[PDB]
Amino acid sequence: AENLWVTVYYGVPVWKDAETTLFCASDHNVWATHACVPTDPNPQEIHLENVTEEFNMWKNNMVEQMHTDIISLWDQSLKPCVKLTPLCVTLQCTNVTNNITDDMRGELKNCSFNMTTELRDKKQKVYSLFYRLDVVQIKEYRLINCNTSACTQACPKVSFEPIPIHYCAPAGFAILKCKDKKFNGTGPCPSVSTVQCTHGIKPVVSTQLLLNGSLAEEEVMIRSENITNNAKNILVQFNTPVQINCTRPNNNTRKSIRIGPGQAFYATGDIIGDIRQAHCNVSKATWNETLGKVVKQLRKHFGNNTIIRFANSSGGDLEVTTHSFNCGGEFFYCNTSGLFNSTWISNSNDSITLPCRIKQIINMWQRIGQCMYAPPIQGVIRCVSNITGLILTRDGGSTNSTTETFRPGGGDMRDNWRSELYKYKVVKIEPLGVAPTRCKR
Amino acid sequence: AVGIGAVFLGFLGAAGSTMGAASMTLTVQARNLLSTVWGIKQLQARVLAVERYLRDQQLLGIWGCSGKLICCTNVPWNSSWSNRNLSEIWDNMTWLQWDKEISNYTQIIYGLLEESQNQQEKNEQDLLAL
Amino acid sequence: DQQLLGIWGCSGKLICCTNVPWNSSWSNRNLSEIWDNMTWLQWDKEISNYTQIIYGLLEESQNQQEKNEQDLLAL
């Protein structure tokens, strides 16, 4: 009675979840745009009506691809640069005590040593200023990395400034974007569009604080894979940014030492004037208001009468125990202890100053056996940035006490990329379809 | 006639529309299927896309629907695959829901189409022999 | 190129003539002065600016033809 027959259609709008490899789109830098395609001046977006999709920020392969690409670019940038093999020698060091304050005592060492020259039968005697974090006693010292591995020096022409990067999918695939505000990264998204590729994402590297990021359009957003489990980090996205001003005030000097044929080592000659600690400033009232918003949002998941505490970091490496970042080529590690120190109970112009340190031997990613020596920057340096989120961890959490304490976290860089690619996913089209129809061939 | 805008459904715009309405824009979807270490991955992706396109075209040609976007066939519709009538399929459903429903009865239909087309080719040859 | 040919219904053919009428605005010359007094390069140079609209017309015409064929076979 039905007398229906199979009929084939090619080009039906159907898709399935899939994994693939996306490519560049961008408008001397470590993040090489030379091997990246130009971007379209007028990106196109198609809003899909009546399409409700499923999203999960904690199972996105784009984060893994971004991490791999960033690591590969960082490795590639350092290949054509000098290797500081001859720098593992016996240094003879002395304390620097010329116009120093009470908090910069012992931080700097004036170290002299012997070095090779362009002719392989000659030696020279030179000296440089090193940081206490870089030299370990063997009045004789050695560089910290000498017993682990020899490692290279960043070329002084490449810039560390992040540049936006867009990720565009191949043919036969599509990128779906969730336009639903208040979307907490997991679950169903009623409102969806299709994009050729994503907004410009700056690969900013930092810990304990998200800088130069994107802001929630409505209010503070809290995200966690399993908020009941205390072993999972909590990503907080601010509604408004908090300005932070960091500075190294020492008037540094740079000198070049020829260590071979066409090979130079950039040493810190001397410091002009006084010697003082680098530091950062953040407004007090703005931080208090932001923490008020954060605790108000946290009360939603952890009860309405719970006491919410902010405390110091637990411990570990300097990278994870401190807010670590890079300001114009100099690598800062700073003590965010005046920020996360307070308790909240259910019911002018001064600023918080974070004093902090600088380093030159860097293990950027969580790897052992590869350094990166940062040449000194000449003159005073200052920078300003926006804080637009936090990475928190809940300690303990047992039912014995009704007080919840949160501490800063970080270390893993995948959490930094996850905060930007939370509303995107990749699918692959399935154009072949079959239906009942009343013809017959 | 002035102060009026014109907009066309683009690419996957008909995803949420019914099957009958979505079947009027197959060309926009069809046209989009075709178009040192990183170069290897990019080229691998391109080769994979080409291979997928060629596989789909080969299947279409094997079923005798070569060069057609809509091609109705001779295979009868078994009621076991689905019981819904045309009223509740082409005006009250979308292609994604249909794919979800019929995802477990796909290969047998393909085999039936292949065998049917082989039979038609043999019969056509026999007819032309006379 | 093969996909473009197939979408117009000219699959598997080198000379495939279609149903779209020839708008006089594209070219006013008659067949006598085209097929016997000109070359393909000159013609391509002449009509290089009226190409995409013809492609769209061919696409829509083939879609309509397929729909009509399906409707005819429905009976």
Partner: antibody, heavy 129, light 107 residues
């Protein structure tokens, strides 16, 4: 579906410039759309202020208010704004942002028809001497 | 400018009564005319587009007819939610001019 929301100051002084904004969701300002600004004073007839083409930027204002109306678009914020200079007592009214278009379900302008329109909730503005 | 005259300016009718509203333009604008409905203190709802096509979602009781310089909106069976101000609008040529608004209330 396209949704529109209006915003701006609820009170303005005489001879000042009234600035209103309309934010659109579900569509792009740069698309082929005609974004419309209209007003209705209390107990009177609707008065169309002006319009702008999203893609081309061409603006057409009412001849009566052609010398005091300026309509612009912000793609980054996905909105469009109206500026009315030298506001007076007669300018007190409820202002609406709107957009109407034709959605075609096929290819080229021949295939069926679907007329769509969207009007915002509107914002009441009063001019004080 | 194309001027519009809408009649009756004010009408009173009961539930279930047939309501007719006429709108006339200074010059031929056919078929470019739309009919909208506006409740007190709310946005306008599009009832008819092109003067003969019922907008999607509108109840079938509303209808439109006419051409040239005379268009008519008809409510076959008035309902409690139908008491509102009805307007006729054109888009053939600028400026876009609305009608004075026919107000239908409960008798």
């Amino acid at each position: 579906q396209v949704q529109l929301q209006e915003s701006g100051p609820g009170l303005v002084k005489a001879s000042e410039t009234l600035s209103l904004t309309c934010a659109v969701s579900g569509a792009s300002v740069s698309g082929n759309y005609y974004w419309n600004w209209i007003r209705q004073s209390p107990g009177k007839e609707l008065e169309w202020i002006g319009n702008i083409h999203g893609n081309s930027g061409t603006t057409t204002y009412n001849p009566s208010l052609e010398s005091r109306v300026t309509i612009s678009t912000d793609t980054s914020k996905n909105q469009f704004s109206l500026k009315l200079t030298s506001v007076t007592g007669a300018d007190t009214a409820t202002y609406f942002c709107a957009t109407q278009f034709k959605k075609y379900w096929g290819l080229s302008v021949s295939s069926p028809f679907s007329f769509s329109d969207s009007w915002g909730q509107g914002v009441l503005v009063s001019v004080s001497s | 400018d194309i001027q519009m005259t809408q009649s009756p300016r004010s009408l009173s009718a009961s539930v279930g009564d047939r309501v007719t509203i006429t709108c006339r333009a200074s010059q031929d604008i056919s078929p470019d005319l739309n009919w909208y409905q506006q409740k007190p203190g709310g946005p306008l709802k599009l009832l008819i587009y092109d003067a003969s096509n019922l907008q999607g979602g509108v109840p079938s009781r509303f209808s439109g007819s006419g051409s040239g310089t005379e268009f008519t909106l008809t409510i076959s069976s008035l309902q409690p939610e139908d008491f509102a101000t009805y307007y006729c609008l054109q888009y053939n040529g600028y400026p876009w001019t609305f009608g004075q608004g026919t107000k239908v209330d409960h008798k």
